[PDB]
Nucleic acid binder design. Structure first.
Lengths: 614, 261, 261, 261
DNA sequence: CTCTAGACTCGACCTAGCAGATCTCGAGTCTAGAAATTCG
DNA sequence: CGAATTTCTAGACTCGAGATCAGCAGCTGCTAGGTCGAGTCTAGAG
């Protein structure tokens, strides 16, 4: 693909202009990357495709990559001489060749031998051949010649033939360079952000290795959870904990402590913490909940690395001590401090109050009412429940009843059709994406104000990292409010300006998380802000910035605004066998507090057949 | 120019039966004192030995030493097409790649002659370490065939204990454990009934059961088998072919740590 | 200390193979009266009962009535080691979970011992009602052995219309219909060829031949079948085990309503 | 209405196996002369014809000639369950729609009737020529089959060569070459254990061993098989059906390709 | 007034998919080899 | 006792579903769905 040639080359040529990049790489690796650079342009593709492919011995006869040549073999020996594609050559490892070996000729090789049950499945045949390693007493019967496995691999190669593989060093160095580029495609027109890289994230080249060691493990553990085999995970996690234990007393994390929270996102301890965090759901799922109880305790000792982590451990203690390990005396102590911890907020906490209410009403904890006299309240005024009907699959009969075509749909159109005929033509959906979209264009350069360290660290960043963290707002508390109140006072025509301008000023330019499809037409957006203005959205963003980690979504799904009649029909999609979460109306309550038009839209379970009954 | 004529063609028929699948290719070493076959399997696990003398042949002459490699399967395809009573007229030409197999009719009415292509094997001077065996067991072949065949289903290895009161065969598996032992014959003078055991020191070894079936193919050859054992020595199974010679089956013992890992 | 010594090993050999194809596990109800088996089939359609009187055994003892659930499938393979003429010595000991089988050669030169593993099976008892039947015939075993098989080529649903002058074991299928009518015989010197029938009321019902083929595996047990029928009552197929026991088979008639569907 | 009672049903029984593997549908030209059968093989290469005289039957009478067809496959499965020493009374009505089986027993104690569906076939008659043959060979039929399957291991083509002192059966395969010649022996008083070849002119042809294997299916019809061969003439393999009739085979010789060029 | 068994409810509880082609595979079926059997 | 016949059993061929791959999806939270222990209502008996 022409994409792959430009992409990897763009990555390298962009990571080049970083003096830290050369600082953290030895002259040997510099020679390595340069000798990739001098490599043939058509020879680049072969290493590119294989690099982003699985690490396993593969025969070129199996390979079919044609866009270089039907006989690109001379490139193969050239690149082998370059010292990367280790060919058949040094292959004295029976397991690897068995892995290359396929089952049919594996069955044939079984036939020419005597082994027990030469008709089984792939792996147990493999370790059956591995039991053939246990020898050198019957092979030494006459002449010694202990290479019975040597004979095995010789006949295997006769069966298999040629293969290639990559040495570990080059793969390791490109892994490091790619993760350096990533730091938490060439077609992407990046925004108007320049750069503000000031401070190096890490502290030493040794430190980054452990992340590389951990990142591999973290992905490994991620696959372990999709297997059901956490048992192997813990032993290396113990080693990882031992690796943590060995590196608990290391100053690198202290500089991360010095690093802002958006730079604290990854930290030796934090990585090890998230390693130990997965250990907990490793522990709980294998029902070793008591240790998982112990881990969160030492976790709760730490708060600095991702402050939005202590609250999770509070739920961990409750969940551990309620569902399986019923242990009252601690879990009351937990739930109390859990409801009080600052990082515990919104849905993360409002569930806990109902959890507190549900727990206190239970006979088990009904005895400890005296410890449950500090209950907050979120008295709600549940929004008018417009309960509608419509076909379900979902399936929509949109249009005239004469054409009741299926055309599979979702719950949106049902309400959309109901509300569009209710004089609310425009407005599809999108929770709080649109509000962020409104937030994006108008405040863009304020949002992307620079000069602050590592705002645009990479050469490709769009969001200045701290976007997730509340320190974004604290950074520009004066700057935001000046622009914020201006929008609050700005009339509709003024809003159209920064909408259309930033729409054009940053068209194509990567709009971080801003979604252009939210504004299907720019004039529609300018017509949308003609319906918006001041407190309507200004109240929203005040809540957004600081309370950001915990408030990405949950907003009314539908937005259904009248394009020309100003008045909008904001909607939370709901229905029977469903309910509004504790946090869900926390949007609506303040929305209805500012007099928003949110409309709870319950949906009667109505099927295709059902309407025919009447 | 080698040419050997054996009246009892069935003996040459039977000998291939055991070697038909146990060995695929071998060198047919022939000397003036008789026939001697010795080769190895593809698994490098067992050795087969032949000691056919020149005396047993009705008419024998081997002008010069030959050692020729021919396919085992090819020969078995030909031995099957001759009756159990035809007179073998084996005749091998000096460096001509033609083996004259003539199956003479005892009726003197049919003529059966066959020739096959000759291949090229390699000789590796197999070492034959001669050693005395503490436990020597002679017992009829037919009974031996059962014990090896019966214990095949229960397990895959046998722990042989040379008990002076009578040798015992024990095999274990996921189905359970089963031990079979016999009593040495004292009063039955029949050679096809002796369970005589030679005792010097008890020995307990282990072997693969997947081969005992192959070796027991030689039951049509003789009525009694001889098994000799000691500490850390290969299993030996010898068949006495009348006065024609003896054939011996070599089987190195299974290593004790193979089951451990 | 349950012990049962029966000289006729073949009859014990003969009983197992009939049970292999229908039952996976069962509970062995043994008593001082003798060995009694009441085990409904794995397919949950047919019922099989077996009872062995203690006096039939050459040496029978039963201190306490045990009820062991043993894997039925594996039993034959151990039994396949037993010869056609060995003396079986069923024996159980205390509270262990192992049954002892000993096979003795008639010449007392080969003693075979074996051990299996017992499992825990629930003791499910089903009531056995005793009553008379409509069409009762004493009909030779080898006779029907083909009859189930021969008409198994036609279809899988016979409509038995037993009458006063023989049998009307008809069948049908897409290729055609199989219509056999055996003539009742009474003036036969031997009782092995008599097909005498006692009639009170004709009955017309239907069965699936697949089970019928399974129910014929016990042919070597005897030569005189005591199969009988009545309206809407499961079939009974009883085999007299010489003077050793009785082997009865139960199968409910197939309802004609499913044939319409 | 046609009735044919045959005491020797075994002769009628063993006919079907020869015709099974090569013929599926056929027509039976039935007249007062006896039973006649002509049917080209399914592959349209070899010709198989059958003739029986009516006088061989114990009872036979046919008022009006009939040419009616039945699948060969179905009838043999029916005849599978029958015994070899039974009495059969083949019978067919004028309106050809079903075939009734009048199977009897030597003790006249068990009788079974079966009904076969008939079917219609186009009566395709081919006029075979009668002529003298160059080399005609009569020899033990069992011996002829024994020669075939040896040469089938080599190739699928045997060179027929009537020579001065017998035939020169020669198979040429990839693995090797197989030459078999039998001395012309006529001094033996037992004509069944003898070969007689008449000389008119030497002629050499080759035939596919696939059909020879099928043709050898009729070996136990007669102890001797007569072979008549001629230049550019289909092979003749005839079996005398005791005194009941005769059965001869046609197989057109293969065209010798110009492999030498 | 109180204790217990059954139906309605409601709130908690858990799990799969993303995207089309591609091999790969894993059970299902047949027929020749293996073997008991059995009769003149 | 040998050979035929039949049966038994394993090796070969078919099919349809399971797993994987590459250039991109993962945004993960709303939706659907099967579940469960406790709360709650009611009918019959004391």
């Amino acid at each position: 693909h022409p994409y792959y040639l430009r992409s990897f080359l763009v990555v390298l040529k962009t990571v080049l202009e970083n003096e830290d990049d050369m600082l953290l790489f030895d002259e040997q690796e510099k020679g390595i990357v340069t000798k990739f650079y001098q490599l043939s342009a058509t020879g680049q593709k072969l290493y590119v495709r294989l690099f982003q492919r699985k690490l396993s011995w593969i025969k070129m006869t199996k390979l079919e990559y044609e866009e270089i040549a039907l006989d690109l073999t001379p490139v193969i020996e050239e690149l082998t001489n370059a010292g990367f594609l280790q060919t058949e050559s040094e292959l004295q490892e029976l397991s690897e060749v068995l892995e290359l070996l396929s089952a049919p000729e594996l069955k044939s090789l079984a036939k020419t031998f005597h082994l027990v049950n030469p008709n089984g499945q792939k792996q147990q045949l493999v370790d059956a051949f591995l039991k053939l390693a246990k020898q050198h007493s019957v092979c030494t019967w006459g002449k010694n010649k202990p290479g019975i496995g040597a004979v095995i691999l010789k006949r295997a190669k006769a069966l298999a033939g040629q293969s290639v593989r990559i040495c570990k060093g080059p793969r390791a160095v490109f892994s490091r360079i790619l993760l350096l580029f990533s730091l938490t495609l060439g077609r992407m027109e990046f925004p108007s952000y320049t750069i503000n890289r000031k401070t190096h994230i890490f502290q030493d080249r040794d430190d980054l290795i452990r992340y590389a060691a951990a990142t591999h493990m973290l992905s490994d553990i991620s696959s372990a959870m999709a297997n059901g085999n956490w048992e192997e995970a813990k032993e290396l996690a113990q080693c990882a904990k031992r690796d943590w234990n060995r590196l608990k007393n290391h100053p690198s994390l202290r500089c991360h402590e010095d690093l802002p929270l958006f730079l604290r996102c990854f930290t030796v301890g934090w990585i090890y913490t998230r390693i130990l965090s997965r250990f907990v759901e490793i522990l709980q799922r294998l029902h070793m909940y008591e240790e998982a109880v112990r881990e969160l305790e030492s976790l709760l000792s730490q708060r600095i690395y991702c402050p939005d982590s202590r609250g999770r451990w509070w739920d961990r203690l409750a969940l551990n001590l309620h569902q399986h390990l019923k242990r009252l005396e601690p879990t009351i102590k937990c739930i109390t401090e859990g409801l009080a911890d600052p990082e515990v907020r919104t849905g993360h906490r409002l569930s806990l109050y109902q959890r507190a209410v549900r727990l206190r009403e239970s006979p088990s904890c009904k005895k400890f009412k005296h410890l449950f006299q500090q209950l907050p309240e979120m008295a709600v005024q549940d929004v008018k429940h417009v309960t509608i009907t419509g076909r379900l699959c979902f399936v929509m009969e949109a249009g005239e009843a004469a054409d009741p075509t299926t055309v599979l749909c979702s719950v949106e159109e049902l309400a959309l059709a109901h509300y569009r005929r209710s004089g609310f033509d425009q407005g599809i959906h999108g929770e709080g994406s649109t509000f962020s979209t409104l937030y994006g264009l108008l405040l863009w350069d304020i949002i992307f104000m620079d000069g602050i360290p590592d705002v645009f660290r990479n050469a490709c960043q769009a969001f200045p990292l701290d976007l997730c963290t509340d320190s974004f707002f604290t950074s520009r508390r004066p700057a935001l409010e000046a622009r914020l109140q201006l929008i609050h006072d700005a009339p509709e025509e003024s809003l159209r300006a920064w909408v259309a301008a930033t729409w054009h000023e940053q068209e194509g330019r990567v709009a971080s998380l801003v979604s252009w499809d939210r504004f299907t037409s720019l004039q529609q957006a300018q017509d949308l802000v003609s319906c918006l203005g001041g407190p309507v959205l200004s109240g929203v963003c005040r809540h957004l910035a600081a309370d950001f980690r915990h408030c990405r979504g949950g907003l009314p799904d539908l937005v259904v605004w009248n394009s020309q009649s100003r008045h909008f029909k904001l909607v939370e999609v709901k229905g029977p066998n469903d309910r509004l979460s504790h946090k869900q109306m926390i949007w609506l309550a303040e929305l209805q507090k500012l007099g928003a038009e949110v409309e709870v839209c319950h949906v009667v379970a109505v099927g295709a057949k059902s309407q025919s009954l009447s | 120019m080698f040419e050997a004529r054996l009246v009892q063609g069935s003996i040459l028929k039977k000998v291939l039966e055991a070697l038909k699948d146990l060995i695929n290719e071998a060198c047919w070493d022939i000397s003036s004192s008789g026939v001697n076959l010795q080769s190895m399997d593809s698994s490098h696990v067992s050795l087969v030995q032949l000691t056919l003398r020149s005396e047993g042949f009705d008419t024998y002459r081997c002008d010069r030493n030959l050692a020729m490699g021919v396919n085992l399967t090819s020969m078995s395809k030909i031995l099957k097409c001759a009756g159990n009573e035809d007179i073998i007229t084996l005749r091998a030409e000096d460096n001509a790649d033609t083996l004259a197999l003539v199956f003479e009719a005892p009726n003197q009415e049919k003529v059966s002659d066959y020739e096959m292509k000759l291949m090229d094997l390699d000789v590796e001077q197999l070492g034959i370490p001669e050693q005395e065996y503490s436990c020597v067991v002679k017992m009829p072949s037919g009974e031996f065939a059962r014990i090896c065949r019966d214990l095949s289903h229960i397990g895959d290895a046998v722990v042989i204990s040379c008990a002076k009161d009578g040798v015992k065969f024990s095999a274990s598996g996921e189905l359970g454990n089963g031990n079979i032992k016999l009593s040495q014959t004292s009063n039955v003078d029949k050679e096809e009934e002796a369970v005589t055991i030679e005792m010097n020191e008890p020995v307990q070894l282990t072997f693969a059961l997947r081969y005992l079936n192959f070796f027991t193919k030689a039951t049509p050859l003789s009525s009694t088998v001889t098994l000799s054992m000691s500490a850390d020595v290969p299993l030996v199974v010898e068949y006495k072919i009348a006065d024609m010679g003896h054939l011996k089956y070599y089987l190195a013992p299974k290593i004790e740590d193979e089951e451990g890992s």
